[PDB]
Coordinates of C-alpha atoms and ligand atoms in Angstrom, one line a residue:
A24 CA 19.1 -7.5 36.4
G25 CA 17.6 -10.9 35.4
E26 CA 19.0 -12.4 32.2
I27 CA 17.3 -13.9 29.1
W28 CA 19.8 -15.5 26.8
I29 CA 19.6 -16.0 23.0
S30 CA 21.9 -18.0 20.7
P31 CA 22.1 -18.9 17.1
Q32 CA 21.8 -22.6 18.3
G33 CA 19.0 -21.9 20.8
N34 CA 15.3 -22.8 20.6
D35 CA 12.3 -20.7 21.4
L36 CA 10.8 -23.6 23.5
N37 CA 13.7 -23.2 25.9
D38 CA 13.5 -21.2 29.2
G39 CA 16.2 -18.7 28.2
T40 CA 18.9 -19.5 30.8
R41 CA 22.5 -19.5 29.4
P42 CA 22.7 -23.3 29.2
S43 CA 19.2 -23.3 27.5
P44 CA 18.9 -20.2 25.3
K45 CA 16.2 -18.9 23.1
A46 CA 16.6 -18.6 19.4
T47 CA 14.9 -15.3 18.6
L48 CA 14.6 -11.8 20.0
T49 CA 10.9 -12.0 19.5
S50 CA 10.6 -14.9 21.9
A51 CA 13.0 -13.4 24.4
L52 CA 11.1 -10.0 24.5
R53 CA 7.9 -12.0 25.0
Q54 CA 9.4 -13.7 28.0
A55 CA 10.5 -10.3 29.4
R56 CA 7.0 -9.0 28.7
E57 CA 5.6 -11.9 30.7
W58 CA 8.0 -11.3 33.6
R59 CA 6.8 -7.7 33.8
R60 CA 3.1 -8.6 33.5
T61 CA 3.4 -11.1 36.4
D62 CA 5.8 -9.0 38.6
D63 CA 8.4 -11.6 38.5
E64 CA 11.2 -10.7 40.9
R65 CA 13.9 -11.1 38.2
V66 CA 12.6 -7.7 36.8
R67 CA 13.7 -5.9 39.9
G68 CA 17.0 -4.5 38.6
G69 CA 16.2 -4.5 34.9
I70 CA 16.0 -7.2 32.3
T71 CA 19.0 -7.9 30.1
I72 CA 18.5 -9.8 26.9
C73 CA 22.0 -11.2 26.3
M74 CA 22.8 -12.5 22.8
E75 CA 25.6 -14.9 21.9
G76 CA 27.9 -13.8 19.2
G77 CA 26.6 -14.5 15.7
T78 CA 24.1 -13.6 13.1
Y79 CA 20.4 -13.6 13.7
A80 CA 18.3 -13.4 10.5
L81 CA 14.9 -11.8 10.6
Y82 CA 12.0 -12.3 8.3
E83 CA 9.8 -9.7 10.0
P84 CA 10.5 -6.8 12.3
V85 CA 10.9 -7.2 16.0
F86 CA 7.9 -5.3 17.5
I87 CA 8.7 -3.6 20.8
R88 CA 5.4 -2.3 22.2
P89 CA 4.1 -0.5 25.2
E90 CA 3.9 -3.7 27.3
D91 CA 7.7 -4.0 26.8
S92 CA 8.3 -0.8 28.6
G93 CA 10.9 -0.7 31.3
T94 CA 11.3 2.0 34.0
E95 CA 14.3 4.0 34.9
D96 CA 15.3 1.5 37.7
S97 CA 14.3 -1.5 35.5
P98 CA 15.2 -0.9 31.9
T99 CA 15.2 -3.5 29.2
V100 CA 18.7 -3.7 27.7
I101 CA 19.5 -5.8 24.6
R102 CA 23.2 -6.5 24.2
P103 CA 25.9 -9.1 23.2
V104 CA 27.5 -11.2 25.8
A105 CA 31.1 -10.2 26.6
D106 CA 32.6 -8.4 23.6
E107 CA 31.1 -10.8 21.0
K108 CA 29.7 -9.4 17.8
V109 CA 25.9 -9.7 17.2
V110 CA 24.4 -8.9 13.8
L111 CA 20.7 -8.6 13.3
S112 CA 20.2 -9.2 9.7
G113 CA 17.4 -8.5 7.4
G114 CA 19.0 -10.4 4.6
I115 CA 19.5 -13.9 3.2
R116 CA 22.4 -15.8 1.7
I117 CA 22.6 -16.7 -2.0
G118 CA 24.3 -20.0 -2.7
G119 CA 24.5 -22.5 -5.6
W120 CA 26.6 -20.3 -7.8
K121 CA 27.5 -21.7 -11.3
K122 CA 30.1 -20.4 -13.7
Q123 CA 29.0 -19.0 -17.1
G124 CA 32.0 -17.3 -18.7
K125 CA 33.6 -14.5 -16.7
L126 CA 30.2 -14.3 -14.7
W127 CA 28.6 -16.5 -12.2
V128 CA 24.9 -17.1 -11.9
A129 CA 22.6 -18.3 -9.1
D130 CA 18.9 -18.9 -8.5
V131 CA 17.4 -16.4 -6.2
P132 CA 15.4 -18.3 -3.6
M133 CA 11.9 -17.6 -2.5
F134 CA 11.5 -15.3 0.5
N135 CA 8.4 -15.5 2.8
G136 CA 6.7 -17.5 0.0
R137 CA 7.3 -15.1 -2.9
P138 CA 10.0 -14.1 -5.5
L139 CA 12.6 -11.9 -3.9
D140 CA 14.0 -8.7 -5.6
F141 CA 16.6 -6.4 -4.2
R142 CA 18.7 -3.3 -5.0
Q143 CA 21.8 -4.1 -2.9
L144 CA 24.1 -7.1 -2.8
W145 CA 27.0 -7.7 -0.4
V146 CA 30.0 -10.1 -0.8
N147 CA 32.0 -10.9 2.3
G148 CA 30.9 -7.6 3.9
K149 CA 31.7 -5.6 0.8
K150 CA 29.0 -3.9 -1.2
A151 CA 28.9 -4.9 -4.8
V152 CA 27.8 -2.6 -7.6
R153 CA 24.3 -2.8 -9.2
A154 CA 25.3 -2.9 -12.8
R155 CA 25.6 0.5 -14.3
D156 CA 26.8 2.2 -17.6
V157 CA 29.8 4.1 -16.1
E158 CA 32.1 3.2 -13.2
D159 CA 33.5 6.7 -12.6
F160 CA 30.6 9.2 -12.1
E161 CA 32.8 12.0 -13.5
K162 CA 32.2 10.2 -16.8
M163 CA 28.4 10.3 -16.7
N164 CA 26.5 11.4 -19.9
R165 CA 24.5 14.6 -19.7
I166 CA 20.9 15.1 -20.9
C167 CA 20.1 17.2 -24.0
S168 CA 16.6 18.6 -23.2
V169 CA 13.2 18.1 -21.4
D170 CA 9.8 17.9 -23.0
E171 CA 7.5 18.4 -20.0
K172 CA 4.2 18.5 -21.9
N173 CA 5.0 15.1 -23.5
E174 CA 6.9 13.5 -20.6
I175 CA 10.0 12.9 -22.7
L176 CA 13.6 13.2 -21.7
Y177 CA 16.1 13.6 -24.6
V178 CA 19.6 12.3 -24.1
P179 CA 22.5 11.4 -26.5
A180 CA 21.8 8.3 -28.6
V181 CA 25.2 7.0 -27.8
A182 CA 24.4 6.9 -24.1
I183 CA 21.5 4.3 -24.4
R184 CA 22.7 2.3 -27.4
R185 CA 23.4 -0.7 -25.1
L186 CA 19.8 -0.8 -23.9
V187 CA 18.2 -1.1 -27.4
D188 CA 17.9 -3.9 -30.0
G189 CA 18.6 -3.7 -33.8
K190 CA 15.3 -1.8 -34.3
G191 CA 16.0 0.9 -31.7
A192 CA 13.4 -0.5 -29.2
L193 CA 14.1 -0.9 -25.5
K194 CA 15.5 -4.4 -24.8
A195 CA 16.4 -3.9 -21.1
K196 CA 13.0 -4.5 -19.7
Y197 CA 13.6 -3.0 -16.1
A198 CA 16.3 -0.5 -16.9
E199 CA 16.5 2.6 -14.7
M200 CA 17.9 6.0 -15.1
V201 CA 19.4 7.9 -12.1
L202 CA 19.1 11.6 -12.9
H203 CA 21.2 14.3 -11.1
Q204 CA 19.0 17.4 -10.7
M205 CA 20.4 20.2 -8.7
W206 CA 20.4 19.0 -4.9
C207 CA 18.6 15.6 -5.5
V208 CA 18.8 12.5 -7.7
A209 CA 15.7 11.0 -9.1
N210 CA 15.2 7.2 -9.9
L211 CA 13.3 6.9 -13.1
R212 CA 12.3 3.6 -14.6
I213 CA 12.6 3.5 -18.4
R214 CA 9.4 2.5 -20.2
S215 CA 10.6 3.1 -23.8
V216 CA 13.4 4.5 -26.1
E217 CA 12.9 6.1 -29.5
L218 CA 16.0 6.9 -31.5
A219 CA 15.9 10.5 -32.9
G220 CA 19.1 10.6 -34.9
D221 CA 21.8 12.0 -32.5
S222 CA 19.3 12.1 -29.6
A223 CA 17.1 9.5 -28.0
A224 CA 13.6 10.1 -26.7
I225 CA 13.4 8.5 -23.2
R226 CA 9.9 7.8 -21.7
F227 CA 9.4 6.6 -18.1
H228 CA 6.9 4.5 -16.1
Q229 CA 4.2 5.7 -13.9
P230 CA 3.8 6.8 -11.2
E231 CA 7.1 8.6 -11.3
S232 CA 6.8 10.1 -14.8
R233 CA 3.9 12.4 -14.0
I234 CA 5.7 13.6 -10.9
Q235 CA 9.1 13.9 -12.4
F236 CA 8.0 16.1 -15.3
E237 CA 5.6 18.5 -13.5
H238 CA 7.5 19.1 -10.1
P239 CA 9.5 22.4 -10.4
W240 CA 12.0 22.0 -7.6
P241 CA 14.5 20.4 -8.2
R242 CA 14.2 20.0 -11.9
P243 CA 16.7 19.0 -14.6
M244 CA 19.4 21.4 -15.7
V245 CA 19.4 22.3 -19.4
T246 CA 22.0 25.0 -20.1
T247 CA 24.3 26.7 -22.7
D248 CA 27.5 26.5 -20.6
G249 CA 28.1 22.8 -20.1
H250 CA 26.1 22.2 -16.8
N251 CA 23.4 19.9 -18.1
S252 CA 22.0 17.3 -15.7
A253 CA 24.2 14.2 -15.6
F254 CA 22.7 10.7 -15.4
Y255 CA 23.7 7.1 -15.2
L256 CA 21.9 4.0 -16.2
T257 CA 21.4 0.9 -14.2
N258 CA 19.5 -2.4 -13.7
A259 CA 20.2 -4.1 -17.1
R260 CA 22.1 -7.3 -17.9
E261 CA 23.7 -5.4 -20.8
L262 CA 25.6 -3.1 -18.4
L263 CA 27.2 -5.8 -16.3
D264 CA 30.8 -5.8 -17.6
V265 CA 33.4 -5.1 -14.8
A266 CA 34.4 -6.9 -11.7
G267 CA 32.0 -6.3 -8.7
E268 CA 28.9 -5.7 -10.8
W269 CA 25.6 -7.7 -10.5
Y270 CA 22.3 -7.8 -12.2
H271 CA 19.2 -9.6 -10.9
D272 CA 16.9 -10.9 -13.7
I273 CA 13.5 -10.8 -12.0
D274 CA 11.8 -12.6 -14.9
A275 CA 14.2 -15.6 -14.6
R276 CA 14.8 -15.2 -10.8
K277 CA 18.6 -15.5 -11.5
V278 CA 21.3 -13.2 -10.3
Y279 CA 24.5 -12.7 -12.3
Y280 CA 27.8 -11.5 -10.6
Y281 CA 31.3 -10.7 -11.9
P282 CA 33.4 -11.8 -9.0
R283 CA 36.3 -9.6 -7.6
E284 CA 39.8 -10.5 -6.6
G285 CA 39.6 -13.2 -3.9
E286 CA 35.9 -13.9 -4.1
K287 CA 35.4 -17.6 -4.4
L288 CA 31.7 -18.1 -4.9
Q289 CA 31.7 -21.9 -4.6
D290 CA 33.6 -21.8 -1.3
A291 CA 31.8 -21.5 2.1
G292 CA 34.2 -18.7 3.3
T293 CA 32.5 -16.5 0.6
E294 CA 29.1 -15.1 1.6
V295 CA 26.8 -13.3 -0.8
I296 CA 24.0 -11.5 1.2
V297 CA 21.0 -9.8 -0.4
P298 CA 18.5 -7.7 1.7
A299 CA 15.0 -9.0 2.2
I300 CA 13.1 -6.8 4.7
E301 CA 12.9 -3.0 5.4
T302 CA 12.9 -2.9 9.2
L303 CA 14.6 -4.9 11.8
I304 CA 13.3 -3.2 15.0
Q305 CA 10.1 -1.3 15.3
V306 CA 9.7 0.4 18.6
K307 CA 6.1 1.6 18.5
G308 CA 3.6 2.8 21.1
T309 CA 0.6 5.2 21.0
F310 CA 0.6 8.8 22.3
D311 CA -1.4 7.6 25.4
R312 CA 0.6 4.3 25.8
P313 CA 4.2 5.1 24.9
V314 CA 7.1 2.5 24.8
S315 CA 9.7 3.5 27.4
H316 CA 13.2 2.7 28.9
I317 CA 14.6 0.4 26.3
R318 CA 18.4 0.3 25.4
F319 CA 20.1 -1.3 22.6
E320 CA 23.9 -1.7 23.3
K321 CA 26.6 -3.0 20.9
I322 CA 24.2 -4.5 18.4
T323 CA 24.9 -4.4 14.6
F324 CA 22.0 -3.8 12.4
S325 CA 22.4 -4.9 8.8
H326 CA 21.0 -5.9 5.4
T327 CA 17.8 -4.0 5.1
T328 CA 16.0 -3.4 1.8
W329 CA 13.9 -0.6 0.3
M330 CA 12.2 -1.5 -2.9
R331 CA 10.0 1.6 -3.4
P332 CA 12.3 3.1 -6.1
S333 CA 12.0 -0.2 -8.0
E334 CA 8.2 -0.2 -7.6
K335 CA 7.2 3.5 -8.0
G336 CA 10.4 5.4 -8.9
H337 CA 11.8 8.0 -6.6
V338 CA 11.4 11.8 -7.1
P339 CA 12.4 13.5 -3.9
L340 CA 12.0 17.1 -3.0
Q341 CA 14.9 17.1 -0.7
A342 CA 16.7 14.9 1.8
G343 CA 15.4 11.7 0.3
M344 CA 11.8 12.5 1.0
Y345 CA 9.9 11.4 -2.0
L346 CA 7.1 13.5 -3.7
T347 CA 3.7 12.0 -3.9
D348 CA 2.4 15.1 -5.7
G349 CA 4.2 18.2 -6.6
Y350 CA 3.6 21.1 -9.1
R351 CA 4.1 24.7 -9.9
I352 CA 1.5 27.3 -8.9
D353 CA 0.7 30.5 -10.9
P354 CA -0.2 33.0 -9.5
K355 CA 2.2 32.4 -6.6
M356 CA 0.8 31.9 -3.1
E357 CA 1.2 35.0 -0.9
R358 CA 1.9 34.1 2.7
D359 CA 1.7 35.5 6.2
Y360 CA 4.4 36.7 8.5
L361 CA 6.7 38.2 5.8
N362 CA 7.2 34.9 4.0
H363 CA 8.3 35.0 0.4
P364 CA 5.8 34.2 -2.2
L365 CA 5.6 30.4 -2.8
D366 CA 5.7 29.0 -6.3
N367 CA 5.0 25.3 -5.8
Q368 CA 2.9 22.8 -3.8
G369 CA 4.4 19.5 -2.5
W370 CA 3.4 16.5 -0.5
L371 CA 5.9 13.9 0.7
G372 CA 6.4 10.3 1.9
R373 CA 9.1 8.9 4.2
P374 CA 11.6 6.3 3.3
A375 CA 11.9 3.0 5.3
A376 CA 14.4 2.6 8.2
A377 CA 16.4 -0.2 9.7
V378 CA 15.3 0.8 13.2
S379 CA 12.2 3.0 13.8
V380 CA 11.1 4.6 17.0
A381 CA 7.6 6.2 17.4
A382 CA 5.5 7.1 20.5
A383 CA 8.2 6.4 23.0
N384 CA 10.4 7.8 25.6
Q385 CA 14.0 7.0 26.8
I386 CA 14.8 4.7 23.9
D387 CA 18.6 4.6 23.8
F388 CA 21.3 3.3 21.4
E389 CA 24.8 2.9 22.9
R390 CA 27.6 1.8 20.5
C391 CA 25.4 0.2 18.0
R392 CA 26.5 -0.2 14.4
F393 CA 24.2 0.6 11.4
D394 CA 26.0 -1.1 8.6
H395 CA 25.1 -2.3 5.1
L396 CA 21.6 -0.8 4.7
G397 CA 19.3 -0.1 1.9
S398 CA 17.5 3.1 3.1
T399 CA 17.6 4.9 6.5
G400 CA 19.7 3.7 9.4
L401 CA 17.9 4.9 12.6
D402 CA 14.6 6.8 12.4
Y403 CA 13.0 8.7 15.5
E404 CA 9.8 9.2 13.6
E405 CA 7.1 10.8 15.8
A406 CA 6.2 11.5 19.4
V407 CA 9.5 10.5 20.9
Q408 CA 10.7 12.2 24.2
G409 CA 14.4 11.9 24.9
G410 CA 16.6 9.0 23.9
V411 CA 20.4 9.0 23.7
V412 CA 22.0 7.8 20.4
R413 CA 25.6 7.7 21.4
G414 CA 28.8 6.1 20.2
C415 CA 27.0 4.6 17.2
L416 CA 28.6 3.9 13.8
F417 CA 26.7 4.6 10.6
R418 CA 28.3 3.2 7.4
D419 CA 27.4 1.8 4.1
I420 CA 23.9 3.2 4.0
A421 CA 22.0 3.9 0.9
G422 CA 19.9 6.8 2.3
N423 CA 20.0 9.0 5.4
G424 CA 22.0 7.8 8.3
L425 CA 20.0 9.2 11.2
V426 CA 16.5 10.7 10.8
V427 CA 14.5 12.6 13.5
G428 CA 11.0 14.3 13.4
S429 CA 8.5 15.4 11.0
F430 CA 9.0 16.4 7.3
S431 CA 5.3 17.4 7.3
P432 CA 2.6 14.8 7.7
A433 CA 1.6 13.0 4.6
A434 CA -1.5 15.2 4.1
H435 CA 0.1 18.4 5.1
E436 CA 1.6 20.5 2.2
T437 CA 5.3 20.7 3.0
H438 CA 5.7 24.5 3.1
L439 CA 2.9 25.1 5.5
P440 CA 4.2 25.5 9.0
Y441 CA 3.9 22.4 11.2
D442 CA 2.8 23.1 14.7
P443 CA 0.4 20.5 16.0
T444 CA -2.2 21.2 18.7
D445 CA -1.3 17.8 20.2
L446 CA 2.2 18.7 21.3
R447 CA 3.0 15.1 22.1
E448 CA 3.4 14.5 18.4
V449 CA 6.7 16.5 18.1
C450 CA 10.0 14.8 18.7
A451 CA 11.7 16.5 21.6
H452 CA 15.0 16.3 23.7
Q453 CA 16.8 13.8 21.5
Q454 CA 20.6 13.5 22.3
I455 CA 22.7 12.4 19.4
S456 CA 26.4 12.4 20.3
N457 CA 29.7 10.7 19.6
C458 CA 28.5 9.0 16.5
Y459 CA 30.6 8.4 13.3
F460 CA 28.9 8.6 9.9
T461 CA 30.7 7.6 6.8
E462 CA 29.6 6.3 3.4
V463 CA 25.9 7.2 4.0
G464 CA 23.7 8.4 1.2
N465 CA 25.7 6.1 -1.0
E466 CA 22.7 5.5 -3.3
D467 CA 20.3 8.4 -2.7
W468 CA 22.9 11.2 -3.1
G469 CA 20.3 13.8 -1.8
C470 CA 20.6 12.3 1.7
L471 CA 22.3 13.3 4.9
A472 CA 24.3 11.9 7.7
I473 CA 22.0 13.5 10.2
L474 CA 18.6 14.8 9.1
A475 CA 16.5 16.4 11.8
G476 CA 13.2 18.0 10.5
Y477 CA 10.6 19.6 12.6
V478 CA 12.1 18.9 16.1
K479 CA 12.5 20.7 19.3
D480 CA 15.2 20.6 22.0
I481 CA 17.5 18.4 20.0
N482 CA 21.1 18.2 20.9
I483 CA 23.4 17.0 18.1
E484 CA 27.0 17.2 19.5
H485 CA 30.5 15.7 19.0
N486 CA 29.6 13.7 16.0
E487 CA 32.0 13.2 13.0
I488 CA 30.8 13.0 9.5
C489 CA 32.7 12.3 6.3
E490 CA 32.4 10.8 2.8
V491 CA 28.8 11.9 2.2
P492 CA 27.1 12.9 -1.0
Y493 CA 25.5 16.2 0.1
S494 CA 25.2 18.2 3.4
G495 CA 26.4 16.8 6.6
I496 CA 23.7 17.9 9.1
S497 CA 20.3 19.4 8.1
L498 CA 18.2 20.9 10.9
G499 CA 14.6 22.0 10.4
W500 CA 12.1 22.0 7.6
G501 CA 9.1 24.0 6.0
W502 CA 10.7 26.9 4.1
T503 CA 8.9 29.3 6.4
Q504 CA 9.7 32.1 8.8
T505 CA 6.3 31.5 10.5
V506 CA 7.0 30.5 14.1
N507 CA 6.1 26.8 14.5
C508 CA 6.8 23.8 16.9
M509 CA 10.6 24.2 16.5
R510 CA 12.6 25.7 19.3
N511 CA 15.8 25.1 21.4
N512 CA 17.7 23.1 18.7
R513 CA 21.5 22.7 19.1
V514 CA 24.2 21.6 16.7
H515 CA 27.4 21.8 18.6
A516 CA 31.1 20.7 18.2
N517 CA 30.5 18.4 15.2
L518 CA 33.2 17.6 12.7
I519 CA 32.2 17.5 9.0
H520 CA 34.5 16.9 6.1
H521 CA 34.6 15.3 2.7
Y522 CA 31.0 16.2 2.1
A523 CA 29.2 17.2 -1.1
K524 CA 30.7 14.3 -2.9
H525 CA 28.0 14.5 -5.5
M526 CA 25.5 17.3 -4.9
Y527 CA 25.9 21.0 -4.5
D528 CA 23.5 23.7 -2.9
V529 CA 25.1 22.2 0.1
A530 CA 26.8 22.9 3.4
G531 CA 28.4 21.2 6.3
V532 CA 25.5 22.4 8.6
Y533 CA 22.3 23.5 6.9
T534 CA 19.1 24.9 8.4
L535 CA 15.5 25.5 7.4
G536 CA 12.6 27.3 9.1
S537 CA 12.0 29.4 12.2
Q538 CA 13.8 28.0 15.2
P539 CA 13.5 30.1 18.3
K540 CA 16.7 30.0 20.5
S541 CA 18.6 27.6 18.4
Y542 CA 22.5 27.3 18.2
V543 CA 25.1 26.1 15.6
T544 CA 28.2 26.5 17.6
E545 CA 31.8 25.3 17.7
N546 CA 31.5 23.0 14.7
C547 CA 34.4 22.3 12.4
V548 CA 33.8 22.1 8.7
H549 CA 36.5 21.5 5.9
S550 CA 37.6 19.8 2.7
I551 CA 34.5 20.0 0.6
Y552 CA 34.5 17.8 -2.6
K553 CA 34.3 19.4 -6.0
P554 CA 32.5 17.1 -8.4
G555 CA 32.5 17.9 -12.1
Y556 CA 28.8 17.3 -12.8
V557 CA 27.2 19.7 -10.3
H558 CA 24.6 22.2 -11.4
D559 CA 26.7 25.3 -10.4
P560 CA 30.3 25.0 -9.2
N561 CA 30.2 28.0 -6.9
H562 CA 26.9 27.1 -5.1
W563 CA 28.5 25.4 -2.1
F564 CA 29.0 26.5 1.5
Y565 CA 30.4 25.6 4.9
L566 CA 27.4 26.9 6.8
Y567 CA 24.0 27.7 5.2
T568 CA 20.8 29.0 6.7
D569 CA 18.0 28.4 4.1
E570 CA 14.5 29.8 3.7
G571 CA 12.7 30.7 6.9
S572 CA 15.7 30.3 9.2
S573 CA 15.2 32.5 12.1
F574 CA 16.5 32.9 15.7
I575 CA 19.6 30.7 15.2
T576 CA 22.9 31.7 16.8
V577 CA 25.7 30.6 14.4
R578 CA 28.8 31.2 16.4
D579 CA 32.4 30.1 16.9
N580 CA 32.4 27.5 14.1
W581 CA 35.9 26.7 12.6
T582 CA 35.5 26.6 8.9
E583 CA 38.2 26.3 6.1
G584 CA 37.2 29.6 4.6
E585 CA 34.5 32.2 4.9
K586 CA 31.8 30.8 2.6
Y587 CA 28.3 31.1 4.0
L588 CA 24.8 31.7 2.7
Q589 CA 21.7 33.2 4.3
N590 CA 18.9 32.6 1.8
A591 CA 15.5 34.2 2.4
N592 CA 15.9 34.1 6.2
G593 CA 13.6 35.4 8.8
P594 CA 14.9 37.7 11.6
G595 CA 17.0 37.3 14.7
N596 CA 19.8 35.0 13.4
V597 CA 23.2 36.0 14.9
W598 CA 26.4 35.3 12.8
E599 CA 29.5 35.7 14.9
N600 CA 33.2 34.6 14.7
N601 CA 33.0 31.8 12.1
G602 CA 35.9 30.8 9.9
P603 CA 39.6 29.8 9.9
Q604 CA 40.4 32.3 12.7
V605 CA 38.4 30.4 15.3
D606 CA 40.4 29.3 18.3
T607 CA 42.5 26.1 17.7
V608 CA 41.1 24.6 20.9
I609 CA 37.5 24.7 19.4
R610 CA 38.8 23.4 16.0
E611 CA 40.5 20.4 17.6
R612 CA 37.8 19.3 20.1
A613 CA 35.1 19.2 17.4
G614 CA 34.1 15.6 16.6
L615 CA 34.3 12.4 18.6
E616 CA 35.5 12.7 22.2
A617 CA 38.4 10.5 23.5
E618 CA 36.0 7.8 24.9
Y619 CA 34.4 7.1 21.6
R620 CA 37.3 7.4 19.0
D621 CA 37.6 3.7 18.9
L622 CA 34.7 4.0 16.3
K623 CA 37.6 4.7 13.7
Ligands
CA1 CA1 29.0 -1.6 -16.1

């Protein structure tokens, strides 16, 4: 393989030899593209883009396109030299910190010619806390009631007193409520507060308010037995009061931080990073002209943003997929093929990802690290054939770790079966193995470690998942027993524990929709969390086949106890030998294999 070198001290006018390296991946890919176009002999055995140890900051995604395609004998591989660490960062450094009491304050610089805002902030590789009302979520306040007709949320007056002035009017201009509702959270930006004696009338901004109040599922819990929806409050100067909290004042363009033990903001050995762009690598072809035979190896991807919740709120249906329109229907819709009557209509959007792959084949990630991210880690979006995601770490991710396939096209109501005529559209034959997921969904608690929607021939095996807010692995979509594109899906020998940290209606492995000849086998699930603010404390499981699930063999899974749910399933699922009696050999070989345990 011929080599093209990049360095943090390189220059894009250089020829890309090791003594004279490029400065950017964009320039280095362009040179590789030119070698392939002109049949340069250095292409013969592949092209390896070798990157010197360091951080490479991006102001726009790297666009890997059909003309970048390798072949099986001549792949393009992008990797560090030796065992040096390479970070592709979508963030920028904040300096010029001045002391102002217990807090420090800094001007937020311009990014790509405009004011920058952000929802995450990292200090020496350690995520800081966007300022909120309570530290311990077990201490969240609960709501009092919902007025749907008027779009009002009533909560205890004591909960919001720090956000109002002497006259009971909202004083925290951009304050946000994060509302726990059944199996999702919603991000709802506060427009106004009106004190109503012991209660406070909370109104929210558009566009989220309309969608929040009219969508039926999930919806806020208002109960007589102490299970009302919890919420917390964030994004307000008035809530910044403990070490590690920050608030960014967008009107002043200043950011305030309460430093933690050993953080020395005026020293150069202390790095404050904020995220600036959504997507670092965009692998994108067309269905006729796919991108192919690209491998990323040992690359760290970091510091991506996603500002949609700050701009439009965030009212997801499930798995972090936000509703663009969602309402109750009466009478219910009657459906074909023995489907249960449907009481709602929903259309969805897809969160941004650090790395996206669409219209491609044989796009591999080997021992990459997805670390410090504001939305999704890795997203195999559409029309991808194959690809091996193996040995990767996913950690400190606000949303889903790894996303594959369709959650219904934007215009396609999300309970109607998805089965496109153009079969090229459907993600098929992905292999996701020996990856470790921890501390994902750490903002959007409705998110998963591995979220595969409408896919076919997927193989999810020997992964380990822990410390996640909700389910571990979710496979399928559509809430329908109508036979569709899905078939041949496998979830095998994964290890899932310390899940459902925040959300119930949950399992270690969860399925939706009809999936001919699919398999959930030899997994190991244990040690579920028991949070105090969940909607119903018994509504948790180790393994859970949800509406439509059909033709799935659920067999030989070691689980801590027998606690399973089959809700509104279709036919032909086989449940056999699941539980604590499963052979020890199966129990113990679940998760990372010996070769990849250095991920921990
Ligand atoms: Ca606080």
